[PDB]
């Protein structure tokens, strides 16, 4: 079913109805006028960040190249393969860019310290896929450019998601959400979920340990805030 959308909810309403019970929600009217929303474009990103080295996930492999090279090879025209500048602390690397975002006020409801919040960039073409997995902190995923299809499964449903059987990968599902092998993973079919298309200016709250799967529908840039 669709993730609820709420316009600028109070801190206490967000706390009581979403944060404490661990329920996803999309926050509207919160990040929609951050400077990134109007400023970020391929040209702006090239100008500010083009010469800097970033990690890129290809396919599968992991490599390093400049932001300019990433755009040239994996974003524009007709890329050979899907590449994704995923899960990278770009704003620590480039303080000028950090000026264009801010910490959501709702993070103050956490028990953690503000300067321990991990801020990651997720920048890539249409068609990037982050397979179903769970993270160990709360997340506000802020959509800046393009749209993402997102599927969410509660931690209560872990038994239907067939986690990998190693410590390193136990927070990742073995299932391909959008084309599941139901002969091998029959329990997956029945597991309930939420989904949404997250659009520019919207923030998705992904509760701590909620399983999430993410596919970019367009050229996309998201910023995640991992907080406690
Ligand atoms: O945006 C993506 O492709 C995936 N994002 C996450 O898993 C996250 O923000 O924790
Ligand atoms: Co994640």
222 lines ligand 1 (CB under 6 A): yes
Q: Resolution of the experimental model in angstroms, please?
A: 1.2
Q: Is 162 left (phi over 0), alpha (psi -120 to 50) or beta?
A: left
Number of other CB atoms surrounding residue 187 within 10 Å: 13
Between CA 112 and CA 221 the distance in angstroms is: 26
DSSP secondary-structure letter at 3?
P
Distance, CA of 14 to CA of 168 (rounded, Å): 32
How many CB atoms within 10 Å of residue 5?
13
DSSP single-letter state for residue 106: G
CA of 77 to the centre of ligand 2 (A): 28
Residue 89 CA, ligand 2 centroid: distance in Å: 14
For residues 74 and 56, is the Cβ–Cβ distance under 8 A?
yes
Q: 204 is in which domain, residue-wise?
A: 1-228
Q: What is the largest CA-CA distance in the chain?
A: 50
Q: How far is CA 86 from the centre of its chain?
A: 9
Residue nearest to atom 9 of ligand 1 (CA): 224
Ligand 1 contact, 32 CB (< 6 A):
no
Q: Which residues pair with 139 in a beta bridge?
A: 206, 226
Bridge partner residues of 119 (DSSP): 225
| Ligand 2 centre distance from Cα of residue 225 (Å) | 10
Number of domains in the chain: 1
Instruction: Give how far Cα 196 sits from Cα of 24, 46, 65, 192, 203, Å.
Output: 11, 30, 32, 14, 11
What kind of experiment solved this structure? X-ray
Rounded to whole angstroms, the Cα distance separating 109 from 18 reads: 12
Q: Cα Rg for the chain, rounded, in angstroms?
A: 17
Do 152 and 3 touch, CB atoms closer than 8 A? Answer: yes
CATH number assigned to the domain comprising residue 160: 2.60.120.650
Distance CA 221, CA 126 (A): 10
For residues 201 and 97, is the Cβ–Cβ distance under 8 A? Answer: no
Cβ–ligand 1 contact at 141 (below 6 Å): yes
């Amino acid at each position: 079913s669709t993730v609820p959308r709420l316009h600028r909810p109070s801190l206490q309403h967000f706390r009581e109805q979403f944060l404490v019970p661990g329920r996803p929600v999309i926050l509207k009217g919160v990040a929609d006028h951050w400077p990134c929303m109007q400023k970020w474009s391929l040209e702006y990103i090239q100008e500010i960040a083009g010469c800097r080295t970033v990690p890129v996930e290809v396919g599968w492999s992991q490599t390093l190249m400049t932001v300019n090279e990433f755009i040239s090879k994996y974003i524009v025209n007709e890329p050979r393969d899907v590449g994704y500048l995923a899960q990278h602390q770009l704003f620590d690397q480039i303080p000028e860019l950090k000026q264009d975002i801010s910490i959501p006020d709702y993070c103050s409801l956490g028990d953690g310290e503000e300067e321990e919040i991990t801020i990651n960039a997720w920048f890539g073409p249409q068609g990037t896929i982050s397979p179903l997995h769970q993270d160990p902190q709360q997340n506000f995923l802020v959509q800046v450019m393009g749209r993402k299809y997102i599927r969410l499964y509660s931690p209560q449903e872990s038994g239907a998601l067939y986690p990998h059987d190693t410590h390193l990968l136990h927070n990742t599902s073995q299932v391909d959400v959008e084309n599941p092998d139901l002969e091998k993973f029959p329990k997956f079919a029945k597991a309930p979920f939420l989904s949404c298309i997250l659009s520019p200016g919207e923030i998705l709250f992904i509760p701590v340990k909620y399983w999430h799967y993410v596919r970019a529908l367009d050229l996309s840039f998201s910023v995640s805030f991992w907080w406690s």
